[PDB]
Design an enzyme around this catalytic site. Structure first.
Site, PDB file in Angstrom:
ATOM      1  N   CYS A 226       0.692  -1.373   0.000  1.00  0.00           N
ATOM      2  CA  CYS A 226      -0.122   0.144  -0.014  1.00  0.00           C
ATOM      3  C   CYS A 226       0.813   1.248   0.102  1.00  0.00           C
ATOM      4  CB  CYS A 226      -0.957   0.072   1.114  1.00  0.00           C
ATOM      5  SG  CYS A 226      -0.304   0.201   2.677  1.00  0.00           S
ATOM      6  N   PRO A 249       3.188  -2.724   3.645  1.00  0.00           N
ATOM      7  CA  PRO A 249       2.849  -1.292   3.613  1.00  0.00           C
ATOM      8  C   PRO A 249       3.764  -0.283   3.441  1.00  0.00           C
ATOM      9  CG  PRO A 249       2.511  -2.394   5.782  1.00  0.00           C
ATOM     10  CD  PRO A 249       3.041  -3.518   4.824  1.00  0.00           C
ATOM     11  N   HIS A 250       3.517   0.676   2.847  1.00  0.00           N
ATOM     12  CA  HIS A 250       4.443   1.829   2.300  1.00  0.00           C
ATOM     13  C   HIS A 250       4.132   3.336   2.421  1.00  0.00           C
ATOM     14  CE1 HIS A 250       8.577   1.610   0.443  1.00  0.00           C
ATOM     15  NE2 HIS A 250       8.474   0.187   0.556  1.00  0.00           N
ATOM     16  N   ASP A 251       5.082   4.265   2.277  1.00  0.00           N
ATOM     17  CA  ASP A 251       5.039   5.437   1.694  1.00  0.00           C
ATOM     18  C   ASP A 251       3.991   6.536   2.368  1.00  0.00           C
ATOM     19  OD1 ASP A 251       7.234   4.412  -0.118  1.00  0.00           O
ATOM     20  OD2 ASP A 251       6.626   6.022  -1.400  1.00  0.00           O
TER      21      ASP A 251
END
Length: 423
Positions: A226, A249-251
């Protein structure tokens, strides 16, 4: 000293809860149009870049499109030509065009579907700009040539994937998915995303959200991914034998609930990793074991998180690794027999390690260090760091690790209170 952490109520997160989350009363328009007409498709692909899709489709590139109301898989099957959406046996479908759920679309796959196979050769995949619910079923990346799952061979070889855009909402429950995703932007496997920073300026949609519950994900390039996502819930899932990450999950994502998942067998990197300002989230009561790298990773200024009561064992490097992600709480994790360190903290300050149990790891139970990261691959501009480590350690136990209970090199500060260290 400090009260035990207050973790989110998971009891509302149910296949039955999920099913009541969409409006089925107003249908339901189904077109088959060209992909380049649609922002939701241009935004990870397109014009000087449509060649690959013309090749895959053998013609001007088209998608199945759902908007203005409600459509289920069986609805699509009836209206869309057999060549594009074929029912090869009862409850089993092969899609030979990608499926785009538009902003006003509401798309459902339910128990009526045995398996929906996305054709690899024809370049099928799913994008939703709107509401989507997938329950009690299978959605798999399918090789028509091999007559089976599009099993992983190489990074750059396309495989079908699910992606969702900004403004959207997505619920997947009691669903099986395999062999999705590859080395290509927004195509990692199941990907929840805000729009690319330019298009978000124009569209001004809210950050995407939803739940992935009690489902199973195998052979994914990334099991979950994500980008700038709010409050997403990943509960009760199995991530088995995925290629690069289990859950990624990311950024700038935030308020995430990753709980009661079983993540293992990851072939290249970590089981669970949050990276690049994934803040204020909860990673608790997960089994993360047997991954090629670490069990759980907090990376690149991911802060204000709670990693609680996870069973982290037998990973091929660290149990938990904190990379330049300060101000996090690790409470009551049982970190056992990982090949390297139980809990490793690099370049992170104000880490609170309360009530952890670090046993039988190959190296140190807990290990904290610093490292100058300037003349390296790191974009210091995007991901700054500070070579200082500090931690508060309270309670728990460090026992029978290979290299010793703990080691903390050049700490700014370390405080230890009532920690058990058995000889």
């Amino acid at each position: 000293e400090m009260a035990k952490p207050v973790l989110p109520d998971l009891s509302g997160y149910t296949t039955e809860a999920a099913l009541k989350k969409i409006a089925r009363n107003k249908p339901g328009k189904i077109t088959v149009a060209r992909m380049m007409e649609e922002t939701g498709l241009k935004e990870f692909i397109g014009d000087n870049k449509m060649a690959e899709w013309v090749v895959r489709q053998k013609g001007i590139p088209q998608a199945i499109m759902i908007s203005d109301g409600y459509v289920n898989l069986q609805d699509l099957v009836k209206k869309v030509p057999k060549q594009f959406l074929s029912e090869v046996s009862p409850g089993v479908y092969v899609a030979r065009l990608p499926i785009l759920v538009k902003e006003t679309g509401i798309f459902e796959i339910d128990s009526k579907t045995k398996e929906l196979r996305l054709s690899q050769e024809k370049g099928s995949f799913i994008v939703s700009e709107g509401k989507m619910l997938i329950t009690n079923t299978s959605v798999n990346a399918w090789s028509e040539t091999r007559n089976g799952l599009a099993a992983y061979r190489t990074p750059d070889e396309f495989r079908p994937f699910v992606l969702t855009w900004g403004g959207s909402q997505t619920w997947i429950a009691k669903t099986k998915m395999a062999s999705m995703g590859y080395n290509q932007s927004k195509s990692y496997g199941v990907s929840i995303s805000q729009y690319n920073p330019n298009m978000a300026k124009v569209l001004k949609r809210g950050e995407p959200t939803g739940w992935i519950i009690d489902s199973e994900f195998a052979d994914m390039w990334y099991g979950f991914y994500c980008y700038e996502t709010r409050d997403f819930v990943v509960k009760g899932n199995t991530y088995r034998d995925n290629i690069v990450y289990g859950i990624d999950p990311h950024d700038r994502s935030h308020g995430l609930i990753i709980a009661e998942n079983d993540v293992y067998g990851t072939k290249k990197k970590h089981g669970i990793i949050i990276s690049r300002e994934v803040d204020n989230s909860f990673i608790f009561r997960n089994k993360s074991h047997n991954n090629k790298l670490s069990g759980v990773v907090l990376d690149r200024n991911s802060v204000g998180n709670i990693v609680a009561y996870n069973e982290i064992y037998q990973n091929h490097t660290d149990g938990i690794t904190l990379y330049e992600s300060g101000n996090n709480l690790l409470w009551g994790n049982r970190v056992i027999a990982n090949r390297r360190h139980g809990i490793r903290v690099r370049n992170s300050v104000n880490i609170k390690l309360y009530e952890n149990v670090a046993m039988a790891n190959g190296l140190m139970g807990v290990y904290g260090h610093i490292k100058d990261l300037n003349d390296t691959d790191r974009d210091i501009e995007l991901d700054p760091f500070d070579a200082q480590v500090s931690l508060i350690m309270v309670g728990g136990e460090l026992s029978s690790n290979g290299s010793g209970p703990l080691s903390i090199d050049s700490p700014l500060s370390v405080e230890l209170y009532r920690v058990s260290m058995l000889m």
